A paper describes a structure:
NS1 is secreted alongside dengue virus particles during an infection. It is a multifunctional protein which exists in different oligomeric forms intracellularly and extracellularly, and they play distinctly different roles. The intracellular NS1 (iNS1), exists as a membrane associated dimeric form and is a part of the viral replication complex. The extracellular secreted NS1 (sNS1), exists in higher oligomeric forms. sNS1 likely causes vascular leakage symptoms in DHF/DSS via two pathways—indirectly, by stimulating the innate immune response through activation of complement and Toll-like receptors, and directly, by binding to endothelial cells causing endothelial hyperpermeability. sNS1 when bound directly to endothelial cells causes barrier dysfunction of the cell monolayer as demonstrated in an in vitro trans-endothelial electrical resistance (TEER) assay. Here we show by cryoEM that the recombinant sNS1 exists in multiple oligomeric states: the tetrameric (stable and loose conformation) and hexameric structures.
The 3.5 Å resolution recombinant sNS1 stable tetramer cryoEM map shows clear separation between β-strands. The density of both N- (residues 1–13) and C-terminal ends (residues 341–352) is missing from the map. We observed that the β-roll densities, instead of concentrating at the middle of the dimers as observed in iNS1, have an elongated shape that stretches across the two protomers within a dimer. Fitting of the density map shows that residues 18–27 form a 27 Å long β-strand which pairs with the same β-strand of the other protomer within the dimer to form a long anti-parallel β-sheet (hereafter, referred to as elongated β-sheet). As the resolution of this region is ~4.5 Å, we analyzed their interaction by using a distance cutoff of 8 Å between the Cα backbone. Using this criterion, we observed that this elongated β-sheet from one dimer likely interacts with the same β-sheet from the opposite dimer via electrostatic interactions or hydrogen bonds at both ends of each respective β-sheet (Fig. 2c (i)–(ii)). Hydrophobic analysis shows that these β-sheets have an overall highly hydrophobic surface that also plays an important role in stabilizing their interactions.
Residue numbers in the entry:
A (entry chain B), B (entry chain D), C (entry chain C), D (entry chain A): 14 to 116, 127 to 339
Write the structure that this text describes.
């Protein structure tokens, strides 16, 4: 009989850990580092948080398994501090290697993601090189996956992504971002969950209404993977370039923060970098104004106090 | 604790019946027809199949409940024959009415959807007037719903619609259309299920990659609600303007029809209207050629035999 | 990484049509009838509604394709009228056949489902013989499926079934039955959807709390596939043996029917067969009493008016 | 229109963290401990892992906020080491309290879950006292929840549970347990995921086929929350009472561990406590026998090497 048919559900993959990358075995990757090191590369800064974990998970192996190939170097991991900036280089295969598939530290230093930007510039660090392909299938081990990007690219991973819309709401999904929008009378952004900030450009292939979108009228800037959509719009708002992105995990919501309220005026100044966490004396500013805002204003919530959108400045 | 969170599944609403529209009670609707009839309107042709059913489900009521308001007219329903064309008019509130909320046929004739295009032109028939709003909630009775469109519009319903994508496939969903696309190496259309053909324009708010889309490089023409997307692309193809849309229920697939095969050549002519159901003698044409096609070609499947895309013509 | 994992959703398969059974091709089935006819079998009465449709869908073929095997007989289908009773016989393979896989009506009559119980007794009709196995996979055509039951059995089909529970509610699912229960303070039945009534016994392998269940304390009797569960319990209630099961499609709900109310008393009589659709004069009985009931009482809703549970009788 | 309807999906809640219990505010709970302490109670050992985390998450508050009520004591948290045994007492409200809703350590010791069984016996520790009710709704903060159990009970929490079955497989779900069974020809257990081991009895309200189940023919013993079901059966097997439950996180699978194979014989001895992780010399035993087993045998997998079921013993 018939029958159309119809299926598919999405998504069930928020805040998971994750992630490893062996396989792909460090054989090809380590040989790439050796051939990259002689090319003058110095550091690696990850494009995703789990990528930084995968380096940290496998780094002691490359500390010695690379030395098993009579080549000497040292690699040390670091920590995560938002924003997770972008490197200006990448490494490519080069699939030829001379080593054994499963068969330190006096030499020069090859950096790994760490708060040491003053040591080596981002212009001398590879970025967004290794990524799925292949897949995440199928026993939660990925996968064998994490193939090398043949072509230099700025877009994020195209595999672990999602976007959907059903009659009241549209969401954009990846490992970290959970931008969500709703429809009261006009489609507009409602809430979003941020757990990191990646500088990779959001890919058009997983957006909605990607027509006539103004880069200056967004909510989340494109440079921090802001989806090109009308769902990134909101009346009386503009891009949050100077927002508190340096914080690690964030939250998007239209509301009033605790003990504070905002009055719509016109004497209030123009946009400016966010504030309110915290006052030097530990106090707060109960007064708040915004010129072209729209109540409820944008509050910033995370592993900290409160911040407000750049349209919101204190009266005094 | 936290918590993101994450939910939502879609979709579960293919080939359902459906559909009624009372409530909204025929009180306001019937009074609108009475005020529309004195405005020179003659016919109604539905924008969706279920709308035609709703007329057929409620038509005997307006045959007499309208006469209870000392106004006389006659309305007769018809049948469905693809394509379900579009009327060039609409009716609008006008919310003032003088009748009773629940408290023929000698006069002039007000037409209803039926195969009688030679009687009254489509330019004298209302179209795409009544639609949800409000909703479908919540006991499968809609809803109270089916409010009047204040503004004349060409886009289809924005409520009962859906679209999604998850790491391998993207689909566009409504009551009837089930356009689906996949990713082997480049994103392209794979299959689609057609059960009617509505002339309402597909709205951009539920599409994907709606940038740089060429109206001449689609698969499904925009005039028959072809989503503006790269997922409507396919290499070596163009728009199916002259396809066998007159058939009621269709099927999109890249394959070879039974007992036939296609050889890629260059002497084969250019595109032309589809064929192969059936030969005047009941035979078939085993030979097939296409100039700029790409195997497997486009076959048309439905409540009939086989048809091929316009790029596919017989050698002889 | 890890990873548990976790998936599965259920269900999306209510009120679907469905259903065909070719394949399995009528080759083996028809030969079985021919060998069954010489065994003295006379009638066929389906165990599911869709089975009756499958007979009706394929019956003209066996009217003549059986005659192609130089054996003559006649078969006529009928209609569906609740309840869909059970036959006391069945047909079994016997896989040997002498005919062609795809290569009337003067002789005796082999009855099929029809309101002709006075003609041939149910004790001379086969029942619950053909069923899935194999499956419903995978293009909505089943399947090839509908294999013969090697062993005589009374339980319903074990393939197309479902049951689940998640923190507030438990449901039992098949093609037609949608028994549902909830938890306010003690687990109890809340609502159920009936679209047919099959006499096959509900299988224990898809129930819940199948311990210490009293056959006299159910809501839906076992003989009409009442799941053996505590979720079939309700305080102050018993089995609905004499309910209005003769109606085709039903509805289970705890509420008051329109224009009527029930007062809890003790002078009211004991249980008795249901009523209230309709009064001989077309009226209703606004007064209602029940001895050991519990408000809200059980109302019967369907393609008819209202009926009440046997615990509910009029005061006069 | 109609409409049945049909919905519900399950589950999406594996390996989450979780969990906090404020609210309910420690006001009532702390006063309960103070009144419990004068009743001779000594320690607390949690029934779930997240409960132990909840104690660890809130313990410093009760270290001092209890002292704010001019009563002095000390509470020290510990660690988790399987199995998470059961205490023989509980604490009950007693809702009367004299303190302030949000307005150490010289005194006696009130113990908390930790590897100190030699200090205070489990017979002098409360267990399975606090649990949801109320709910987990609705911002991932629960909830306000964690109400006191009015009645002493041995069953686990009834709220955060799940069980389902759909045409090929049945699963039992809670925070940690993911017992799963399938159907090849007879229903039998296939795989299960264990991340803790709780001594609370599995509740019958969320099982399947809870009839005629023999406590000696299960796979997972009832004392460690083994669902009473036929899905806990397996031919040629019995209960895993003496299994390696002392390990924290486990895995159920029918397979052969790496580098080892099992031969079915009869000279092999009877059942015995599991082994094979590891040999005193770090070796393995490639030879394996089992009297009444059935290939593939039961392997134990987790944060360790391999173990085999009690039916499997070495030949030598």
């Amino acid at each position: 009989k018939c029958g159309s048919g119809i299926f598919i559900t999405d998504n069930v993959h928020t805040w998971t850990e994750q992630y490893k990358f062996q396989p792909e075995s460090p054989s090809k990757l380590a040989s790439a580092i050796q051939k990259a090191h002689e090319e003058g590369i110095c550091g690696i800064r990850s494009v995703t948080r789990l990528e930084n974990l995968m380096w940290k998970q496998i780094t002691p192996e490359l500390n010695h398994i690379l030395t098993e190939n009579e080549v000497k170097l040292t690699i040390m991991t670091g920590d995560i501090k938002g924003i997770m900036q972008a490197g200006k280089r990448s490494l490519r295969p080069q699939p030829t290697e001379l080593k054994y598939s499963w068969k330190e530290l006096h030499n020069h230093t090859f950096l790994i993601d760490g708060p040491e930007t003053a040591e080596c510039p981002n212009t001398n660090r590879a970025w967004n090189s290794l990524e799925v392909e292949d897949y995440g299938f199928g026993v939660f081990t990925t996968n064998i996956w994490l193939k090398l990007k043949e072509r230099q690219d700025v877009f994020c991973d195209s595999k672990l992504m999602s976007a959907a819309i059903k009659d009241n709401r549209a969401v954009h999904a990846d490992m970290g971002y959970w931008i969500e929008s709703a429809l009261n009378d006009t489609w507009k952004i409602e809430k979003a969950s941020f757990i990191e900030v990646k500088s990779c450009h959001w890919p058009k292939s997983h957006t909605l209404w990607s027509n006539g979108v103004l880069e200056s009228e967004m909510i989340i800037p494109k440079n921090f993977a802001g989806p090109v959509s009308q769902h990134n719009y909101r009346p009386g708002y503009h891009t949050q370039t100077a927002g508190p992105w340096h914080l690690g995990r964030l939250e998007m919501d239209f509301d009033f923060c605790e003990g504070t309220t905002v009055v719509v005026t016109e004497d209030c100044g123009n946009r400016g970098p966010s504030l309110r966490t915290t006052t030097a004396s530990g106090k707060l500013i109960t007064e708040w104004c915004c010129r072209s805002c729209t109540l409820p204003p944008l509050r910033y919530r995370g592993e900290d106090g409160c911040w407000y959108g750049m349209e919101i400045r204190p009266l005094k």
